[PDB]
Structure formats: C-alpha cells, structure tokens
Amino acid sequence: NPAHAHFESFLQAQLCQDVLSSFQELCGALGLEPGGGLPQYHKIKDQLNYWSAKSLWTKLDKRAGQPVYQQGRACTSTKCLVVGAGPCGLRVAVELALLGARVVLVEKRTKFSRHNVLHLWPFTIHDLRALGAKKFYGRFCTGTLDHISIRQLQLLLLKVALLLGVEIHWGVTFTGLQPPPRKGSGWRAQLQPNPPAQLANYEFDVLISAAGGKFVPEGFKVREMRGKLAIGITANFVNGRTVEETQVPEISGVARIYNQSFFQSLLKATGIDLENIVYYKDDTHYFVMTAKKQCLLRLGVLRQDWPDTNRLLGSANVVPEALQRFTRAAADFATHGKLGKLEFAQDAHGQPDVSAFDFTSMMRAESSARVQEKHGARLLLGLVGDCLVEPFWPLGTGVARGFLAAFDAAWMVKRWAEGAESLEVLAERESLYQLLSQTSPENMHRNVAQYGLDPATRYPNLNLRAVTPNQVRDLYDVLAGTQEELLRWCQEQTAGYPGVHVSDLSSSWADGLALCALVYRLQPGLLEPSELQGLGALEATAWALKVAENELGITPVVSAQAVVAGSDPLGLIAYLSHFHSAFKSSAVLFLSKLQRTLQRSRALCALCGEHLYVLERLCVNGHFFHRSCFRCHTCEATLWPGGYEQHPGDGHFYCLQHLPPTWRRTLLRRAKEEEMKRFCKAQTIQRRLNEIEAALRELEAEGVKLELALRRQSSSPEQQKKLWVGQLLQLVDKKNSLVAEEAELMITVQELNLEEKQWQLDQELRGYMNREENLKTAADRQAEDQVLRKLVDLVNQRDALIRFQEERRLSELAL
Ligand SMILES: Cc1cc2nc3c(=O)[nH]c(=O)nc-3n(C[C@H](O)[C@H](O)[C@H](O)COP(=O)(O)OP(=O)(O)OC[C@H]3O[C@@H](n4cnc5c(N)ncnc54)[C@H](O)[C@@H]3O)c2cc1C
Ligand SMILES: [Zn+2]
Ligand SMILES: [Zn+2]
C-alpha cells in the first residue's frame, strides 16, 4: 500500500523538510489535511492498518487515556499559540494537544542543525519512552546511555506533534502582540515576514513562549545571576562506531573537587588549563569543557585581552585553527589517544564543529506567568524552557527543568480553562515556580512512572498555597539606624563588668578593657585574674583579639595598635558589627583550627602596595591583605584554610598541590547514576563558589566607593553620614554571610578531597604490596614507609571530620 510506504518514510526521515514532505504525502494518501487536531489522530490510527506499527498506537492511547486529559475535553474551547520549536516548545505543544486544545506553533528557523548532546534524567527517559521513542529512534538509550543529541530529540517530538494534529509554521518570527482595538475581538501576534492570511487572522487565548536563549516577551522582568569569567568550549568529532571506540570509557572531571589528577596531568603534559570537562559517546564524540582567559591568550586561541567579554569571544577575536588544535589536544589527552585520528564533524556551513561560548551569567525571569486584559478579553502568557531559566550546560539540567516547566504550564492552562480566577491561577503558578531552581532527582518522587500534569505526582510535600494571591497583583495588567542598636547592645552586654563604662562607640574602647569584658560576657568562665593583676597596656587588646579569633570564630578587621591609637574607627565599627551580627539571635572556626593544626604538623596591602579598605581586608598571621591578593604564586588560584602554606624563605604562599537477566542492567544503571550524582554535586559546588566570588567582588567595589565618598567629603550633613554608616554595616553583614556560606562549601570540598586522596593512596599501597618476597628492595621499603604515615594522617583527619559532623548533627537534633 502507498500509505505503508509513506508511513515508513515518515518514521525513518532524518531532516525536517523530509518529515514535513512525508507527512504531507501520507495525509494526501488518506484524504486528510495536516493540523486537524485529535480527530485526525483518531482517523489516522483507525484507517492505518499496519499490524507492525501497532505498539505505537497502544503507547499513544495509554498516554492520552489518563483521567487528567478527560479524553481531550479539559481545554476543548481554548486556543493556544506556542512560540519556538525547541525541545520544550514541542513538548508543551504535545501536552496542550493531548488536553484537547487547538495548538498553533511558529518556528523562526527551517532546519534542525544542532549536534550537541543533552543529558537526560530518569523521569525524562521514561517520559520519552512512553511516547514511543524507540520506534522513532532505534539507538534511544540502549544500555547505560542517558543522553541524546538536540536534533534527534527535536525530530522525535516533531513527529509526535505532527501525528497528534498540531499546526506548525516555519520561517515565521514572532515579534510582539497585537492588542484588540475593539470589543469582541481577541489577540493577534505580529509576525515577520508577512504570514498567510489564515495565520495572521488567528486569535488565541494562551501564549506560551519557548524561544529559549535571551528572548522574552514584553512585560516580563528578568535578572541575571553572574559569576567569575568562564569560557566554555564545545566540540563534536565523527564517531566511527568501531569496537575500539566502543570500549573507550566516558570520563568527566571538575577542577580541584572531582578527579583532580586528570587536570594536573593535563596541565603538566600539554599545558592545557581547564576548569571542568565532560565527554559523551553519542552519535558524535561530544566534548564540553571550561577554560580560563590566561591559557587561551597564551596558546593563541584569542588574539587580544579585550575587557568587554562580548568582544572577547567575538568571531573576529577567535582563531579557528588554534581553537581546533586546542580542542584536539584536550580530547586526545582525555581518551589516552584510544580514539585514534579525530576528525571534526561539519556544521551547517561546512566549518569544523568547534565553538566557544560565554559561561559567566545565567538569566532567569522573576515570574513565569502573566495576565493581560483589554476590552474584557484576557490573555495568559507563560514561559517554558531556556527563556524561563537559563541552564548551565555541564550540570545537565536543561531538558529536565524544561519538561517540568512545560508540565506546570500545561497544568496552569488546564486550570485556566476551568474558569478559575486569574489571581489564584497566577498564585499557583508562582508557588510551583518557586521550587524549580532547586529540583533534583533526589528530592522528587522516586516513582517516575506515575508522573503527569498534576504536580502532586512529582513534587513531594507540595504546598499549592506557598504564594498568596495578594503577592501576584502586579502580574495582572488591566488596559537604616543600625548604629543605635549596636551601641545599645554594646552597653547592655558590657554592663555588670566592674571598672568599665561604654558611652560611645569610638572612644570608649581606647582603654582596652571593654573588648575583654565583651569576650568574657559572650562565653562565661574563660579568664580574669591574669589581666586584673597584670599590666595590660596594649596587651589586653591583643589578647582579646587573639582569643576572639581562636575561640569565638570572628576574624579581626582592625589591628590592636589602631584600636588603642584610634586611627581606624571604621575598622572598629565593622568589628563590632560582626560581633552584633554573629550573636544577633561554626565552619569558619573549624577551618581555621584545621589550618593551624596543619601548620603545626610540620614540627596598605603588603603584596601590592595599594591602600586597603574596611571590606577588602583579610587578616592572617597578623598581617592584612586584599581578599583578592591571597592566591598561590604558581597557579594563581584562590587560597583557603587547610590547603595553603607559607615559605619563610621567599615570603610567599603556595597551595598543597604547588608547595615546594536484567540484574546486570539495573546494577550498571545504578552505578552510572551514582557517578553522575557525584559529578553533579562537585559541579554545583564549583558554580556556587564562582557566584560567591563574583558577589564578593561586587560588594567590595560598592563598599570602597561608599567609604571613599564618606572620607573625602567631610563637610556632609550628619544624617547623611549616619545613612552611609548604616549602608556600610549592611554591606559588612552581607559579606560575613557570604564568607560563612563559602566556608560551609569548603567543608564538603575538603571531605571530597580527602576521600579521593585516601582512595588513590590505598590503590598505590596495594600496588606496592603486590610484590612478593622475591621482589624486595630498599625502594619498596622506603615507599611503604612514606605511604604509611600518609595513610595515618588522612585517616586521622577523616576521624576529625566525622567527629565534627557528628557533633553538628547532635547539636541540630538537640533542639
Ligand atoms: C547553539 C546552542 C548550543 C547548545 N548546546 C548545548 C549543550 O551542549 N548542552 C546543553 O545541555 N544545552 C545546550 N544548549 C541548550 C539547549 O538547547 C536547551 O537546554 C534545550 O534545548 C531547551 O531548548 P529551548 O526550546 O528552551 O530553547 P531553544 O531550543 O534554544 O529555542 C527554541 C527555538 O525557538 C526558536 N525561536 C527563537 N526566537 C524565535 C522567535 N522570535 N520566533 C520564533 N521562533 C523563535 C529558535 O529557532 C529555537 O530553535 C544549546 C543551545 C544552543 C542555542
Ligand atoms: Zn593587595
Ligand atoms: Zn598553586
């Protein structure tokens, strides 16, 4: 039959134009018009007797037979417009089609020309399989494979949407909305170029934007989360499908957190300075990596060091040949050269498929839904995909969170069609959206086979009232004195101590007894007799600083000499504000004491000469540096307690790494998922650290500007000075909170580092211990002697860390 051949060509097509032509021919052979909705899907299923393409109809009917859809009657009177035909746009189009609505989709492009590989969560894999992914794609997730190229996913979803009866227009670009000018008329979309009269005269009730990237409809507010400057590089190599390429195992690594030996070896051998790397064995060998500006400049990948990052990575600034050599070297070192000769795949323009991207900042919208009313007509606008939350590619959360957003948007549309008020709909949507940025395979229902539109099948302990309708009224359209409390708290804490009085916040501390009194009051029964009978001339202040640093976990901001001299009042104010914020109602102290023990176990900035300010100060060994000046001399990496050392010979700091049946299937799948979980944890830690560093830089710059303005203009009114000091104290509080969070992160980083080092050391020990009595020499004995003490030290540190964690958990469960 002609219909059978047409259906086979439709299933096996590999190009968008081929899919469209095959579907047009198939609909012509059946006397049908594409875009007829659910009725034409029923007609195709009934009138196509294939006897081998029957499991597909079973899967589609099982999916469409859920009670939530009400047999395509939940949204039978609503009209929708989807902008963009990416994976998320096609997914939401399919979801809206199943509910029984009329879906019109518009795509700017006319081809699917993206070969990059996306990672898939288990529920995403099950969801795609339930739609008949194996029929449309033979190699879909066979074995432990959990990824798919962008164009293959797009083709699969396009075939499903075409079968379900969705009208799709290609080459049309959405630009804006046409408001109704008269009563009784709906909304229309501005499209470029001039569209067919049927499309241009189409009035819709729902607008779902899935344009991804940075596109956003007017009326939506988007804010970007920034980070340290990172340069991403993606590359695709042709996969020969030979056996030798199949035994090559996939690898992944993150800087100094996960799989560090790879990065150290790669830097030592080739000179490639990377931050993270991920490799995928999909239809093409896919490599994604992160690199820094210095290495790219050194190797000639970039021409000039332009401060503007937009011009830094422009087409006129990158050298394609240098980039190709860079990527080839990184890839062939990553896979031990087992892949043989690597030959780049070709993109749409015939160039090699290697590219560079900006990985610094990610956009995200403040709200995921809006309502606009004019002449009594109401329009609901929703965001799905990258246009809602921009993903970090190495983390592999794009498809999963896009699908979750699509499900939530379809649920919102179904609630909207029921006649519920706009405010409650928006409140529920925002309540659901509040959880999107923290979604993970671990904190959702483990029964992924029961997922659906209803949020209760996906989000545990769901609260649909987490946002009240009064907080979303702006999304509906119709057409200070911290100083006084600080002084009062100091006065009330100093009270009861004999021989002291606090009348101000600047000169009362010159005596030096007040600091000791405060430290004694915070923790009772520490000391007293030594200072009373002792001289205590400028030594009381230093002792108070030392005991506060070593016991109360508060780093000093102002030197004791400046305290007694009174030449640094703002530093004293910042110190007292840290005291006030700490006990207004730890990890830093633990890290400091660990660094002190490591240092003992061996038994005006002073580096750059520019003036230090109150916020940029960082005190160590009794000396103050810029927070940004504390880096290793060789790798120029940020130093943290417990992993740095100082050489008195040169007076420099160096890091420790620079200091001179199906049972087998299920088992393998669980092992791969655990490895992916570890990598994701490390990558999330690294990303959060970069964000914290960027925020600290921004707040330090702002505080320096404020403090310089306060100092230079000494004729300002007193109230403005009070306001400036209040803002400075708020900045100090924010900086302290960020530092505490960073210390919390470094605790886990240290745990991971010691675990990895212990594993490597035991592997080395078991390698040494394989030699028998016949193979014995002084070298083996020395190796055993040198490794045993290392194992002793690491296990001692492991007991120290588990003791700290046990104490923390006991304190948490105390209350
Ligand atoms: C070049 C590129 C490379 C990527 N590489 C990776 C990678 O290696 N790993 C990874 O995890 N993620 C990667 N992504 C992101 C990945 O595509 C998304 O995570 C995921 O595909 C979600 O797609 P989306 O529909 O939200 O956005 P997209 O698929 O990017 O956008 C949807 C579509 O909307 C269309 N469109 C745009 N503007 C308009 C308009 N005005 N009118 C009509 N249609 C419009 C575009 O043609 C686009 O194809 C990449 C994205 C791009 C653009
Ligand atoms: Zn400095
Ligand atoms: Zn170093």
Author numbering: 8 to 486, 508 to 613, 630 to 647, 696 to 752, 907 to 1061
What did the publication describing this PDB structure actually write?
MICALs are a phylogenetically conserved family of actin regulatory enzymes that bind and disassemble actin filaments (F-actin). In particular, MICALs bind directly to F-actin and stereospecifically oxidize two conserved methionine residues (Met44 and Met47) into methionine sulfoxides. MICALs are large, multidomain intracellular proteins. The MO non-covalently binds the FAD cofactor and uses NADPH and oxygen to drive its oxidative mechanisms.
We determined the structure of the human MICAL1 using single-particle cryo-EM to a nominal resolution of 3.1 Å. The cryo-EM density map was clearly defined for all four domains but less visible for the linker regions, which were not built into the model. Analogous to its murine counterpart, the human MO domain comprises two subdomains of distinct sizes interconnected by two beta-strands (MOβ9 and MOβ15). A deep cavity located between these subdomains is partially occupied by the FAD cofactor, which, in the cryo-EM structure, is observed in its oxidized state with the isoalloxazine ring in a planar conformation. The interaction between the MO and CC domains is primarily mediated by the CCα1 helix, wedged within a shallow cavity between the large and small subdomains of the MO. The interface between the MO and CC domains is extensive, burying a total solvent-accessible area of 2554 Å2. A key feature of the MO-CC interaction involves a region between MOβ17 and MOα15, potentially acting as a molecular switch. This region includes Trp400, which stabilizes the FAD’s isoalloxazine ring through coaxial stacking, and adjacent Phe399, stabilizing the MO-CC interaction via a cation-π interaction with Arg933 from the CCα1 helix. In the cryo-EM structure, the CH domain binds to the CC domain. The LIM domain engages the central part of the CCα1 and CCα2 mainly through hydrophobic contacts. Given the high quality of the cryo-EM density in this region, we confidently modeled this helix within the L2 linker (residues 630–647), which we have labeled L2α1. This helix is wedged between the CC, CH, and LIM domains and plays a crucial role in the stability of the CH-LIM-CC assembly. Interestingly, the opposite face of the MO domain, which contains the deep cavity housing the FAD cofactor, exhibited minimal changes in deuteration, except for a minor helical region spanning residues 201-206. These observations suggest that the binding site for the CCα1inh helix on the MO domain partially or fully overlaps with the F-actin binding site.
